[PDB]
């Protein structure tokens, strides 16, 4: 499950 927001392009989490 999601734990953080991905900074930058690619995966979002």
């Amino acid at each position, epitope marked *: 499950t*999601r*734990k*953080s*927001i*991905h*900074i*930058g*392009p690619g995966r*979002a*989490f």
Partner: antibody, heavy 112, light 114 residues
């Protein structure tokens, strides 16, 4: 081809409310984080919050919880509803996809 | 409640010189490389230079180098150019299930000497 554009800014009375809209072009949302960041005139960037476009789940800065609501009404729009506005809220408001694709910003000015 | 401390507030170097900017986080970013560096010129949105601590964004020259992990990160700008006159920001992202999801550093102004 992919772009974001903020709208809905402008002059608003102290203690008033305003809703900003962020419109995507050249793509539609597919399980991404759409985020709002602001910058007071001459100051640094300040995070407001993000929404996950598939679940509608939201994540805010502690200072912003309650007063700012991010929603996702369509596959190409997110909104930022802001209440009890104050001079400290005067700022350019940016929306961003995962902090890498940015709109040009829209100015909100809180004044009588 | 997240604290991301960016230093120095300003720095000057001549064309061809090197500038070093640091960000220190009270909590570790999550995952340990989840930090980005931005360049902002006046009247424009911030521009992503580096994400995942050290990955170059498209078109960004290699004289921009990010390093570090967890709670300590560095942006080193070498071979300085006039075009590098701008304000730079770090951004951290965190385990939002236990704390605030993100925070910007306070920014660093770069002045080009001539």
């Amino acid at each position: 081809q992919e772009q974001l554009e903020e709208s809905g800014g402008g002059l608003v009375q102290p203690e008033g409310s305003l809703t900003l809209t962020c419109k995507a072009s050249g793509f539609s949302f597919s399980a991404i984080a759409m985020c709002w960041v602001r910058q007071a005139p001459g100051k640094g960037l300040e995070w407001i919050g993000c929404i996950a476009t598939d679940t509608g789940s939201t994540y805010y800065a502690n200072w912003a919880k309650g007063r700012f609501t991010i929603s996702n009404p369509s596959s190409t729009t997110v909104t930022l509803q802001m209440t009890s506005l104050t001079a400290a809220d005067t700022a350019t408001y940016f929306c961003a996809r995962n902090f890498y694709l940015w709109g040009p910003g829209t100015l909100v000015t809180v004044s009588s | 409640a997240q604290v991301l401390t960016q230093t120095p507030s300003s720095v000057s170097a001549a064309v061809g010189g090197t500038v070093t900017i640091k960000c220190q986080s009270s909590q570790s970013v999550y995952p340990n490389n989840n930090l980005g560096w931005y360049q902002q010129k006046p009247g424009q949105p911030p521009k992503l230079l580096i994400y995942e601590a050290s990955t170059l964004a498209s078109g960004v020259p290699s004289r921009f180098k990010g390093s570090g992990s967890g709670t300590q990160f560095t942006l080193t700008i070498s071979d300085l150019e006039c075009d590098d006159a701008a304000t730079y920001y770090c951004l951290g992202a965190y385990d939002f299930t236990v704390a605030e999801g993100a925070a910007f550093g306070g920014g660093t102004e770069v002045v080009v000497k001539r």
